[PDB]
Amino acid sequence: EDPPACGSIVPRREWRALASECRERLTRPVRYVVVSHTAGSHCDTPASCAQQAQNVQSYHVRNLGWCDVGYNFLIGEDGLVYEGRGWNIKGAHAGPTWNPISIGISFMGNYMNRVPPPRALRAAQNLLACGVALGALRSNYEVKGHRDVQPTLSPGDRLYEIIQTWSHYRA
Amino acid sequence: EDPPACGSIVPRREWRALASECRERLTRPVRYVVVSHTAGSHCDTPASCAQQAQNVQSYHVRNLGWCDVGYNFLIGEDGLVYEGRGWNIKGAHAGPTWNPISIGISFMGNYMNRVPPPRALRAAQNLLACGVALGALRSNYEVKGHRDVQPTLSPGDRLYEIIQTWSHYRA
Amino acid sequence: EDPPACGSIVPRREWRALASECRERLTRPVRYVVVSHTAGSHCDTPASCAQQAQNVQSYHVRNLGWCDVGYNFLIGEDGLVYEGRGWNIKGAHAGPTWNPISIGISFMGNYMNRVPPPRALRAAQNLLACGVALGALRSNYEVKGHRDVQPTLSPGDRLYEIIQTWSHYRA
Amino acid sequence: EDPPACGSIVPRREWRALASECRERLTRPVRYVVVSHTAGSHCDTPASCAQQAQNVQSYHVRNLGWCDVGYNFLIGEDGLVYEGRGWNIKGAHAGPTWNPISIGISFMGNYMNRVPPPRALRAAQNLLACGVALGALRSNYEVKGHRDVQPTLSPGDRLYEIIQTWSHYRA
Ligand SMILES: CCCCCCCCCCCCCCCCCC(=O)O
């Protein structure tokens, strides 16, 4: 409840995910959200994004031998969320301490030198309130930048700068 | 016991490192070597590299609350090697899979667009040879890029292209 | 040209096993390994363990109606691995979710209040390393207690405790 | 991912070996393997074959004044490999020509009028492949029977005929 919805996420089958092999569960309501980037190419259409989400997965599963793409959800510059490991499965995105207690969402692109467009930002915002509404995320969830829990440049200077201002951001 | 056997590393205390509190050990002889870059700025004097080593440790220890700098050794463009957690102590540089069974060496800089100078490449090779000589690494140890084991651009394209040519490189 | 190498196993006919009727194949390479005990009488002679294997197979096939012994491999305290369904055929040891995606090995005996002697531990670990060598296991494979994937005391408190220390264990 | 040793060798300490005193290093990769019998009592349980290694070692050490058991490894009718001098400590099993250029393995019992069990033979073949894998034995290695290289009836007639069928055997 409320039955109304969450909605507007591209399902795995629809971007043609390879089947996941992951079996580890997050405990809902999940306290933490970690915001990463692909550091990769971005994509501004559902056709390229679905392909991009695909490439990201191919890296993690094929090259790295992982169970599935590492993130719970991915965000496109086309303004749409891509189902990754989803609300219920532990991602592989922020280390053995943050993985079991957070949702990892990754913007598809390199935001060291670019700001992700407004619609990508809206998509992430709506995805998170989506999560609250479902009970997947605590009403007072905390948003962390990837670099805050792991040594890395992601989510990129520009993007890290933007999230730092979000309501649910925590030092 | 007679002096003839490798060495010349800038010791922790010399670069002024904070006391490590990491207790977790590796098992010699170690099979795997993971090459990373700091992804931040670079330095080309013992002056600046000692300082920079300090910065990287500060971030991992002060910001991330880690027991020590995540790397086992750092490589400066001054051509010197900076003692991180060293041969014996499990670091935090490539995930719960690679960390207990590798030695993480990080070049201080960003090699997406730039190559480390010869003296930096020699410092790192020579270090490895020294690790073999000591029985800290296997005689047939394997080198991998960060990006071969974790999803990241590290250790930067240019540097990645070089480690790939190494005698001990195995993707 | 044979398949190399790897490890030593007591064949089906050597422990006088009934012919298997199982046909459903596992998809190589397998990501998971599940460790159980049989909660059966234990054994410490080659002869006494071949006998126990027959008893366990006998229970599975005659009373449970399975196509063969449920386990892929069994372990005796005699230090020997007994071949069950083997690397290629799906076992019945861990519920319909895990059976299609795992290798189940089972230590013959009850491990609530006993330890398996070091030789059984060695065989089990070598069996696994050799599953990897063959490409029947993945290199980044993961071992799980039976109790981690089903509500059961299996593989016994003592032995569960033991297998938590393994390189490859993921809860 | 993962330690430690192939061929599931019973370590010297587990059979209660008196401490070794040998020091002559063997020059791996070793070209020859030499197969013998002990001409001693045989044994069929890991307990009786511990005792028997012990009995052989004691003869060599206490009686013959040797630094350690003559054999690099011993093979039991229990089906296990008993560590003697190992891969790098040059053995005393085949005399001044063969000791420095072969690895010597001995089956525990007399094999003039009987054969060792299939598991005993499996364990040796395993052991050998575990040797090549370690770069202890060279890939293209030759196997000789004790008699091919020394005036003795060892390894026993029945055991001799079997090893002549080994892919790697050379008269
Ligand atoms: C292929 C997976 C490697 C796992 C090695 C564990 C089992 C021991 C070896 C059996 C197959 C690979 C041989 C190399 C093992 C060397 C380990 C060591 O020296 O400590």
PDB file of N, CA and C in Angstrom, chain A residues 44-111:
ATOM      1  N   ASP A  44      21.363   8.220 -24.476  1.00  0.00           N
ATOM      2  CA  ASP A  44      20.258   9.126 -24.329  1.00  0.00           C
ATOM      3  C   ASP A  44      18.933   8.632 -24.987  1.00  0.00           C
ATOM      4  N   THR A  45      18.843   7.337 -25.271  1.00  0.00           N
ATOM      5  CA  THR A  45      17.647   6.773 -25.907  1.00  0.00           C
ATOM      6  C   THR A  45      17.393   5.434 -25.313  1.00  0.00           C
ATOM      7  N   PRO A  46      16.145   4.972 -25.409  1.00  0.00           N
ATOM      8  CA  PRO A  46      15.924   3.689 -24.781  1.00  0.00           C
ATOM      9  C   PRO A  46      16.651   2.602 -25.552  1.00  0.00           C
ATOM     10  N   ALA A  47      16.857   2.804 -26.845  1.00  0.00           N
ATOM     11  CA  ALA A  47      17.580   1.799 -27.614  1.00  0.00           C
ATOM     12  C   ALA A  47      19.060   1.706 -27.187  1.00  0.00           C
ATOM     13  N   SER A  48      19.724   2.853 -27.022  1.00  0.00           N
ATOM     14  CA  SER A  48      21.150   2.815 -26.673  1.00  0.00           C
ATOM     15  C   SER A  48      21.287   2.431 -25.211  1.00  0.00           C
ATOM     16  N   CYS A  49      20.465   3.049 -24.367  1.00  0.00           N
ATOM     17  CA  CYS A  49      20.452   2.680 -22.947  1.00  0.00           C
ATOM     18  C   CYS A  49      20.250   1.176 -22.694  1.00  0.00           C
ATOM     19  N   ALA A  50      19.286   0.554 -23.362  1.00  0.00           N
ATOM     20  CA  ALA A  50      19.100  -0.862 -23.124  1.00  0.00           C
ATOM     21  C   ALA A  50      20.390  -1.627 -23.516  1.00  0.00           C
ATOM     22  N   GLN A  51      20.959  -1.239 -24.652  1.00  0.00           N
ATOM     23  CA  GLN A  51      22.281  -1.706 -25.108  1.00  0.00           C
ATOM     24  C   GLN A  51      23.382  -1.374 -24.113  1.00  0.00           C
ATOM     25  N   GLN A  52      23.307  -0.198 -23.510  1.00  0.00           N
ATOM     26  CA  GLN A  52      24.343   0.183 -22.597  1.00  0.00           C
ATOM     27  C   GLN A  52      24.206  -0.679 -21.366  1.00  0.00           C
ATOM     28  N   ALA A  53      23.004  -0.743 -20.815  1.00  0.00           N
ATOM     29  CA  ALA A  53      22.774  -1.550 -19.621  1.00  0.00           C
ATOM     30  C   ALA A  53      23.325  -2.933 -19.896  1.00  0.00           C
ATOM     31  N   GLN A  54      23.137  -3.390 -21.129  1.00  0.00           N
ATOM     32  CA  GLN A  54      23.669  -4.671 -21.593  1.00  0.00           C
ATOM     33  C   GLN A  54      25.200  -4.820 -21.502  1.00  0.00           C
ATOM     34  N   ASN A  55      25.913  -3.844 -22.043  1.00  0.00           N
ATOM     35  CA  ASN A  55      27.368  -3.776 -21.969  1.00  0.00           C
ATOM     36  C   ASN A  55      27.889  -3.755 -20.549  1.00  0.00           C
ATOM     37  N   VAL A  56      27.245  -2.943 -19.713  1.00  0.00           N
ATOM     38  CA  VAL A  56      27.616  -2.918 -18.319  1.00  0.00           C
ATOM     39  C   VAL A  56      27.517  -4.335 -17.748  1.00  0.00           C
ATOM     40  N   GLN A  57      26.391  -5.009 -17.998  1.00  0.00           N
ATOM     41  CA  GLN A  57      26.215  -6.367 -17.458  1.00  0.00           C
ATOM     42  C   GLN A  57      27.260  -7.361 -17.990  1.00  0.00           C
ATOM     43  N   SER A  58      27.568  -7.209 -19.271  1.00  0.00           N
ATOM     44  CA  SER A  58      28.523  -8.100 -19.949  1.00  0.00           C
ATOM     45  C   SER A  58      29.924  -7.978 -19.264  1.00  0.00           C
ATOM     46  N   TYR A  59      30.289  -6.749 -18.890  1.00  0.00           N
ATOM     47  CA  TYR A  59      31.528  -6.534 -18.153  1.00  0.00           C
ATOM     48  C   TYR A  59      31.527  -7.310 -16.842  1.00  0.00           C
ATOM     49  N   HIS A  60      30.429  -7.289 -16.125  1.00  0.00           N
ATOM     50  CA  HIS A  60      30.444  -7.773 -14.748  1.00  0.00           C
ATOM     51  C   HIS A  60      30.298  -9.257 -14.713  1.00  0.00           C
ATOM     52  N   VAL A  61      29.392  -9.751 -15.546  1.00  0.00           N
ATOM     53  CA  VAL A  61      29.181 -11.183 -15.599  1.00  0.00           C
ATOM     54  C   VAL A  61      30.293 -11.923 -16.353  1.00  0.00           C
ATOM     55  N   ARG A  62      30.597 -11.470 -17.572  1.00  0.00           N
ATOM     56  CA  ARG A  62      31.554 -12.205 -18.452  1.00  0.00           C
ATOM     57  C   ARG A  62      32.979 -12.030 -18.063  1.00  0.00           C
ATOM     58  N   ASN A  63      33.405 -10.776 -17.896  1.00  0.00           N
ATOM     59  CA  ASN A  63      34.801 -10.479 -17.589  1.00  0.00           C
ATOM     60  C   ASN A  63      35.116 -10.701 -16.131  1.00  0.00           C
ATOM     61  N   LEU A  64      34.200 -10.268 -15.276  1.00  0.00           N
ATOM     62  CA  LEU A  64      34.494 -10.348 -13.881  1.00  0.00           C
ATOM     63  C   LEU A  64      33.955 -11.621 -13.305  1.00  0.00           C
ATOM     64  N   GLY A  65      33.140 -12.350 -14.070  1.00  0.00           N
ATOM     65  CA  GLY A  65      32.591 -13.592 -13.562  1.00  0.00           C
ATOM     66  C   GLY A  65      31.561 -13.389 -12.444  1.00  0.00           C
ATOM     67  N   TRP A  66      30.980 -12.210 -12.335  1.00  0.00           N
ATOM     68  CA  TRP A  66      29.961 -11.937 -11.267  1.00  0.00           C
ATOM     69  C   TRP A  66      28.602 -12.595 -11.521  1.00  0.00           C
ATOM     70  N   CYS A  67      27.733 -12.660 -10.496  1.00  0.00           N
ATOM     71  CA  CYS A  67      26.444 -13.369 -10.655  1.00  0.00           C
ATOM     72  C   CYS A  67      25.506 -12.616 -11.562  1.00  0.00           C
ATOM     73  N   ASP A  68      25.659 -11.301 -11.620  1.00  0.00           N
ATOM     74  CA  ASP A  68      24.749 -10.378 -12.368  1.00  0.00           C
ATOM     75  C   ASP A  68      25.413  -9.016 -12.416  1.00  0.00           C
ATOM     76  N   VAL A  69      24.839  -8.065 -13.137  1.00  0.00           N
ATOM     77  CA  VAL A  69      25.338  -6.720 -13.083  1.00  0.00           C
ATOM     78  C   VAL A  69      25.261  -6.258 -11.644  1.00  0.00           C
ATOM     79  N   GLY A  70      26.203  -5.385 -11.296  1.00  0.00           N
ATOM     80  CA  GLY A  70      26.564  -5.207  -9.929  1.00  0.00           C
ATOM     81  C   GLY A  70      25.562  -4.386  -9.153  1.00  0.00           C
ATOM     82  N   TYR A  71      24.873  -3.500  -9.875  1.00  0.00           N
ATOM     83  CA  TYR A  71      23.986  -2.521  -9.266  1.00  0.00           C
ATOM     84  C   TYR A  71      22.580  -3.039  -9.122  1.00  0.00           C
ATOM     85  N   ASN A  72      21.803  -2.433  -8.218  1.00  0.00           N
ATOM     86  CA  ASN A  72      20.394  -2.749  -8.084  1.00  0.00           C
ATOM     87  C   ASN A  72      19.536  -2.138  -9.185  1.00  0.00           C
ATOM     88  N   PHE A  73      19.882  -0.914  -9.581  1.00  0.00           N
ATOM     89  CA  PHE A  73      19.192  -0.242 -10.658  1.00  0.00           C
ATOM     90  C   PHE A  73      20.196   0.572 -11.371  1.00  0.00           C
ATOM     91  N   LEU A  74      19.923   0.891 -12.637  1.00  0.00           N
ATOM     92  CA  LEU A  74      20.799   1.796 -13.389  1.00  0.00           C
ATOM     93  C   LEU A  74      20.005   2.900 -13.975  1.00  0.00           C
ATOM     94  N   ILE A  75      20.624   4.057 -14.098  1.00  0.00           N
ATOM     95  CA  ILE A  75      19.910   5.225 -14.607  1.00  0.00           C
ATOM     96  C   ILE A  75      20.421   5.719 -15.949  1.00  0.00           C
ATOM     97  N   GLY A  76      19.509   5.919 -16.902  1.00  0.00           N
ATOM     98  CA  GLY A  76      19.907   6.352 -18.222  1.00  0.00           C
ATOM     99  C   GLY A  76      19.716   7.850 -18.392  1.00  0.00           C
ATOM    100  N   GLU A  77      20.495   8.433 -19.321  1.00  0.00           N
ATOM    101  CA  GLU A  77      20.247   9.792 -19.782  1.00  0.00           C
ATOM    102  C   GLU A  77      18.974   9.965 -20.653  1.00  0.00           C
ATOM    103  N   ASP A  78      18.369   8.838 -21.040  1.00  0.00           N
ATOM    104  CA  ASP A  78      17.105   8.808 -21.692  1.00  0.00           C
ATOM    105  C   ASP A  78      15.971   9.050 -20.676  1.00  0.00           C
ATOM    106  N   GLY A  79      16.322   9.280 -19.425  1.00  0.00           N
ATOM    107  CA  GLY A  79      15.288   9.476 -18.438  1.00  0.00           C
ATOM    108  C   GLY A  79      14.572   8.289 -17.848  1.00  0.00           C
ATOM    109  N   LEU A  80      15.134   7.084 -17.993  1.00  0.00           N
ATOM    110  CA  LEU A  80      14.490   5.831 -17.537  1.00  0.00           C
ATOM    111  C   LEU A  80      15.347   5.001 -16.583  1.00  0.00           C
ATOM    112  N   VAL A  81      14.714   4.301 -15.639  1.00  0.00           N
ATOM    113  CA  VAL A  81      15.465   3.403 -14.759  1.00  0.00           C
ATOM    114  C   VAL A  81      15.550   2.001 -15.374  1.00  0.00           C
ATOM    115  N   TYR A  82      16.752   1.383 -15.336  1.00  0.00           N
ATOM    116  CA  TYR A  82      16.937  -0.003 -15.769  1.00  0.00           C
ATOM    117  C   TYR A  82      17.002  -0.992 -14.605  1.00  0.00           C
ATOM    118  N   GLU A  83      16.093  -1.957 -14.534  1.00  0.00           N
ATOM    119  CA  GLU A  83      16.191  -2.964 -13.444  1.00  0.00           C
ATOM    120  C   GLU A  83      17.514  -3.687 -13.515  1.00  0.00           C
ATOM    121  N   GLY A  84      18.283  -3.595 -12.416  1.00  0.00           N
ATOM    122  CA  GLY A  84      19.479  -4.381 -12.230  1.00  0.00           C
ATOM    123  C   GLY A  84      19.139  -5.528 -11.339  1.00  0.00           C
ATOM    124  N   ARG A  85      19.863  -5.669 -10.235  1.00  0.00           N
ATOM    125  CA  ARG A  85      19.484  -6.661  -9.246  1.00  0.00           C
ATOM    126  C   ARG A  85      18.201  -6.321  -8.457  1.00  0.00           C
ATOM    127  N   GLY A  86      17.637  -5.137  -8.644  1.00  0.00           N
ATOM    128  CA  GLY A  86      16.299  -4.826  -8.037  1.00  0.00           C
ATOM    129  C   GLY A  86      16.269  -4.701  -6.514  1.00  0.00           C
ATOM    130  N   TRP A  87      15.096  -4.718  -5.899  1.00  0.00           N
ATOM    131  CA  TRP A  87      14.935  -4.186  -4.514  1.00  0.00           C
ATOM    132  C   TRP A  87      15.391  -5.205  -3.522  1.00  0.00           C
ATOM    133  N   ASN A  88      15.418  -6.471  -3.940  1.00  0.00           N
ATOM    134  CA  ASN A  88      15.485  -7.541  -2.991  1.00  0.00           C
ATOM    135  C   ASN A  88      16.848  -8.310  -2.988  1.00  0.00           C
ATOM    136  N   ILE A  89      17.704  -8.085  -3.984  1.00  0.00           N
ATOM    137  CA  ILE A  89      18.958  -8.836  -4.087  1.00  0.00           C
ATOM    138  C   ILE A  89      20.188  -7.954  -3.790  1.00  0.00           C
ATOM    139  N   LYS A  90      21.127  -8.473  -3.011  1.00  0.00           N
ATOM    140  CA  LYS A  90      22.341  -7.722  -2.603  1.00  0.00           C
ATOM    141  C   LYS A  90      23.129  -7.359  -3.849  1.00  0.00           C
ATOM    142  N   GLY A  91      23.420  -6.080  -4.044  1.00  0.00           N
ATOM    143  CA  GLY A  91      24.278  -5.721  -5.153  1.00  0.00           C
ATOM    144  C   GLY A  91      25.771  -5.941  -4.835  1.00  0.00           C
ATOM    145  N   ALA A  92      26.615  -5.748  -5.850  1.00  0.00           N
ATOM    146  CA  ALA A  92      28.062  -5.860  -5.710  1.00  0.00           C
ATOM    147  C   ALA A  92      28.558  -4.560  -6.205  1.00  0.00           C
ATOM    148  N   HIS A  93      28.492  -3.536  -5.379  1.00  0.00           N
ATOM    149  CA  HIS A  93      28.732  -2.211  -5.886  1.00  0.00           C
ATOM    150  C   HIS A  93      29.479  -1.339  -4.908  1.00  0.00           C
ATOM    151  N   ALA A  94      29.544  -1.706  -3.627  1.00  0.00           N
ATOM    152  CA  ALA A  94      30.185  -0.763  -2.731  1.00  0.00           C
ATOM    153  C   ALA A  94      30.978  -1.395  -1.554  1.00  0.00           C
ATOM    154  N   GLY A  95      31.424  -2.640  -1.762  1.00  0.00           N
ATOM    155  CA  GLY A  95      32.181  -3.338  -0.739  1.00  0.00           C
ATOM    156  C   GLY A  95      31.329  -4.217   0.177  1.00  0.00           C
ATOM    157  N   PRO A  96      31.987  -5.107   0.959  1.00  0.00           N
ATOM    158  CA  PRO A  96      31.301  -6.114   1.828  1.00  0.00           C
ATOM    159  C   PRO A  96      30.618  -5.470   3.024  1.00  0.00           C
ATOM    160  N   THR A  97      30.955  -4.226   3.312  1.00  0.00           N
ATOM    161  CA  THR A  97      30.247  -3.527   4.388  1.00  0.00           C
ATOM    162  C   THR A  97      29.040  -2.740   3.877  1.00  0.00           C
ATOM    163  N   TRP A  98      29.117  -2.134   2.703  1.00  0.00           N
ATOM    164  CA  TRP A  98      27.947  -1.365   2.262  1.00  0.00           C
ATOM    165  C   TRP A  98      26.925  -2.145   1.410  1.00  0.00           C
ATOM    166  N   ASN A  99      27.426  -3.125   0.643  1.00  0.00           N
ATOM    167  CA  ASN A  99      26.588  -4.026  -0.132  1.00  0.00           C
ATOM    168  C   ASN A  99      25.393  -4.618   0.607  1.00  0.00           C
ATOM    169  N   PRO A 100      25.607  -5.290   1.723  1.00  0.00           N
ATOM    170  CA  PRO A 100      24.406  -5.895   2.349  1.00  0.00           C
ATOM    171  C   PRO A 100      23.415  -4.909   2.979  1.00  0.00           C
ATOM    172  N   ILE A 101      23.694  -3.598   3.003  1.00  0.00           N
ATOM    173  CA  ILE A 101      22.805  -2.695   3.802  1.00  0.00           C
ATOM    174  C   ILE A 101      22.308  -1.538   2.988  1.00  0.00           C
ATOM    175  N   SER A 102      22.590  -1.538   1.690  1.00  0.00           N
ATOM    176  CA  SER A 102      22.261  -0.388   0.846  1.00  0.00           C
ATOM    177  C   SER A 102      21.605  -0.848  -0.473  1.00  0.00           C
ATOM    178  N   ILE A 103      20.962   0.092  -1.178  1.00  0.00           N
ATOM    179  CA  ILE A 103      20.683  -0.075  -2.623  1.00  0.00           C
ATOM    180  C   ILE A 103      21.711   0.697  -3.432  1.00  0.00           C
ATOM    181  N   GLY A 104      22.342   0.075  -4.413  1.00  0.00           N
ATOM    182  CA  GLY A 104      23.264   0.821  -5.275  1.00  0.00           C
ATOM    183  C   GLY A 104      22.601   1.193  -6.604  1.00  0.00           C
ATOM    184  N   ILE A 105      22.613   2.489  -6.929  1.00  0.00           N
ATOM    185  CA  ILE A 105      22.088   2.963  -8.188  1.00  0.00           C
ATOM    186  C   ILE A 105      23.227   3.639  -8.957  1.00  0.00           C
ATOM    187  N   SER A 106      23.368   3.345 -10.236  1.00  0.00           N
ATOM    188  CA  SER A 106      24.495   3.857 -10.984  1.00  0.00           C
ATOM    189  C   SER A 106      23.970   4.625 -12.157  1.00  0.00           C
ATOM    190  N   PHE A 107      24.416   5.866 -12.321  1.00  0.00           N
ATOM    191  CA  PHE A 107      24.128   6.630 -13.524  1.00  0.00           C
ATOM    192  C   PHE A 107      25.035   6.118 -14.660  1.00  0.00           C
ATOM    193  N   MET A 108      24.442   5.862 -15.816  1.00  0.00           N
ATOM    194  CA  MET A 108      25.171   5.343 -16.986  1.00  0.00           C
ATOM    195  C   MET A 108      25.845   6.474 -17.705  1.00  0.00           C
ATOM    196  N   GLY A 109      27.129   6.611 -17.407  1.00  0.00           N
ATOM    197  CA  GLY A 109      27.963   7.711 -17.932  1.00  0.00           C
ATOM    198  C   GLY A 109      29.163   8.003 -17.029  1.00  0.00           C
ATOM    199  N   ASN A 110      29.920   9.015 -17.436  1.00  0.00           N
ATOM    200  CA  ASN A 110      31.068   9.520 -16.658  1.00  0.00           C
ATOM    201  C   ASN A 110      30.772  10.960 -16.298  1.00  0.00           C
ATOM    202  N   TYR A 111      30.520  11.205 -15.025  1.00  0.00           N
ATOM    203  CA  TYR A 111      30.033  12.523 -14.603  1.00  0.00           C
ATOM    204  C   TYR A 111      31.123  13.297 -13.885  1.00  0.00           C
TER     205      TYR A 111
END
